[PDB]
Homo-oligomer: A and B are copies of this chain.
């Protein structure tokens, strides 16, 4: 706290407290570990001649570097005080000492427009044509290498540029590692006046005008985008300028002028020999409502992008063909032709995000619902079962949310494929859809968000039969109300029935039913138990419910009953054994009590070649039946049973649930199929 009380004194500019602590034994070279600012650094920055002299009296190193490698001498280039530079010069080895990015004290006078500081460094040996030497990470991407002339032109300091070109013999056509001269840096100053002045100074000295800057843009191209006829006139005064130069996207200087509705600039470019066959300029000027420019062009007289979606395919071809203004990276047109669905605000339309097909949800930029949607999506990019979030683009008044384009809604999807499966077939599709919903909602909870509006319209299907969660305009962070999760689990239960019933029961119908009514509507015991656990849960239950026998295939259910019936203690009917102790409950009346009286009598006799009405002997009955069903002597028996998995679940619907319940958290859990 002795060194730390001296850094507080320098900021308060109490000169006496500094003298009191420098004689008390405070470190003058003490660098704070965060950014490395020494007391000598902080004094020069705030321009206090007294504190810089007082600390230099106590041996404060003027070569002491900060985190970015800048000495207090270099900082004096920023401050611009000439007598601070005088105080530090006799203790500096090289005046061209640069920080880790290559910034010398000379450059810091140019960047900040410190003329009196710039001149002092000039006569004292500072290099005017010094390129910045930075680290090898920046060098490998052609960064750095700029001079003081470029720095001064970028900042628009007309005073500094004039002195460098005349008094200090600066190279006007010097290049950085990117290949850019000071002319490019000049046209980037938003002030129209300052840019005009520096351009004149640079052109008269011989700066190359056919150079490339940001986006392969020439100075002529930058002048058009700035909408400054004066800057264009100065450039076209050179005859060697290449007017037919193309930028990254292949747009020429003339093309951008017509696009931006600049009558005189477009006229000037044509009169200087710019080619008019680089685009349909007349139609562009026609849609701009520039009658004068349309006529002027009259007197001087391939497609390949293929969309991936099938439903929206032909519509995407049109949206790519037509011209639209870009909202950042998004190409969108608000029309009934490109509408996807209606929402509580703005609706959903087709769009193109970096030439990628996306579905666009629109919000008023002030809407809290828009914020809740974009907040939840950014956290669920790692969620595989949530629609892929591209980004958000603002037009100033409309919040555009671009999402992965899907073919049909879950409600629509179940309808379109309703006629595929015979009515008495294992519904594999229902398990694939519901499981992916468990994964989406489960991982969404671990991400701290709850959907709050789970309905089949909010569940989409892509072209590859994948199911995704979407429409988080009503989502919340469930930390604020921990028990609000129950709504998603309740809606998940209704979705289990909605999907099992292949969509025949409407979701509105399911919302108006009570819990007991919904349970009755389930066709089997596996669905009834699953929905119960969703309405009556106990943080990661949704992952644990993926092992529920609902998601077991009929072979896996058949395989599991076989494997239990192969237990040694069931086959020997060891009443003392653990396995029968678990299967011996208390409970109500099961459908497999006196199970011998409900099976075909022909099968009963051949298998007895001592079955009791216990559960253990039923599974033993399944084990012997399963291993031997295909033997020659059982061909007649095989016709009675048919497919055995369907047979036992048909005669005893509660069998799978009953075995699962008793063996859930036991050693015999190992007989369950792997999940």
Contact = CB atoms under 8 A, between A and B. Distances in A.
A178 B138 contact: no
B378 A141 contact: no
Contacts of A566: 627, 630
B137 A397 contact: no
A66 to B, nearest CB: 13
B364 A334 contact: no
Contacts of A599: none
B334 A365 contact: no
A295 B46 contact: yes
B384 A356 contact: no
A214 B397 contact: yes
A362 B295 contact: no
Interface stretch (A163-171, A339-347, A500-508): A339-347
Given A46-B294, A141-B363, A378 B356 contact: yes
5 contacts: A46-B295, A140-B346, A141-B397, A142-B364, A178-B397
A399 to B, nearest CB: 8
A478 B553 CA distance: 39
B79 A291 contact: yes
A355 interface: yes
A280 interface: no
A590 interface: no
B143 A630 contact: no
B334 A138 contact: yes
B46 A291 contact: yes
A289 B345 contact: no
Contact of A381 (B286, B344, B364, B404): B404
A58 to B, nearest CB: 23
Interface string A544-574: 0000000001010000000000111001100
Contact of A112 (B289, B378, B632): B289
Given A391-B391, A627-B566, A346 B291 contact: no
A281 to B, nearest CB: 14
A32 interface: no
B143 A364 contact: yes
Nearest to A626: B566
Interface in A346-398: 346-347, 354-356, 362-367, 378-379, 381-382, 384, 388, 390-391, 394, 396-398
A620 to B, nearest CB: 13
Interface of A: 12, 45-47, 67, 78-79, 112, 137-138, 140-143, 178, 214-216, 286, 289, 291, 294-295, 298, 334-335, 342, 344-347, 354-356, 362-367, 378-379, 381-382, 384, 388, 390-391, 394, 396-398, 404, 462, 553, 555, 566-568, 571-572, 627, 630-632, 674
Given A12-B298, A141-B363, 18 more contacts: A45-B286, A78-B289, A112-B289, A137-B342, A140-B345, A141-B346, A141-B362, A141-B367, A142-B397, A143-B397, A214-B394, A355-B378, A381-B404, A382-B388, A553-B674, A555-B674, A566-B627, A567-B630
A631 B568 contact: yes
A247 to B, nearest CB: 12
B391 A381 contact: no
A75 B476 CA distance: 48
Most chain B C-beta atoms within 10 Å of own C-beta, residue among A47, A291, A364, A462? A291
A295 B13 CA distance: 10
A462 to B, nearest CB: 8
Contact of A137 (B140, B141, B334): B334
Contacts of A214: 365, 394, 396-397
A674 B559 CA distance: 13
10 interchain residue pairs of minimum CB distance: A141-B364, A141-B346, A142-B364, A140-B345, A214-B396, A47-B291, A137-B347, A568-B630, A568-B631, A78-B289
A345 B571 CA distance: 69
A335 B397 CA distance: 38
Contacts of A67: 335
Nearest to A344: B140
Contacts of A568: 630-632
A45 B398 CA distance: 30
Contacts of A46: 286, 291, 294-295
Contacts of A215: 365
A230 to B, nearest CB: 14
A363 B141 CA distance: 6
Given A142-B364, A378-B355, A291 B45 contact: yes
B137 A45 contact: no
A45 B346 contact: no
Nearest to A355: B378
Contacts of A631: 568, 571
A79 B291 CA distance: 7
A448 to B, nearest CB: 10
Contacts of A397: 141-143, 178, 214
A286 B41 CA distance: 12
A18 B631 CA distance: 90
A12 to B, nearest CB: 8
Nearest to A463: B382
Contacts of A384: 384
A342 B139 CA distance: 13
A553 to B, nearest CB: 7
A398 B364 contact: no
Contacts of A571: 631
Contacts of A363: 141
Contacts of A345: 140-141
Contacts of A394: 214
A390 B396 contact: no
Contact of A632 (B79, B138, B572): B572
Most chain B C-beta atoms within 10 Å of own C-beta, residue among A344, A355, A379, A568? A568
B45 A289 contact: yes
Given A214-B397, A286-B45, A354-B378, A346 B630 contact: no
A540 B649 CA distance: 38
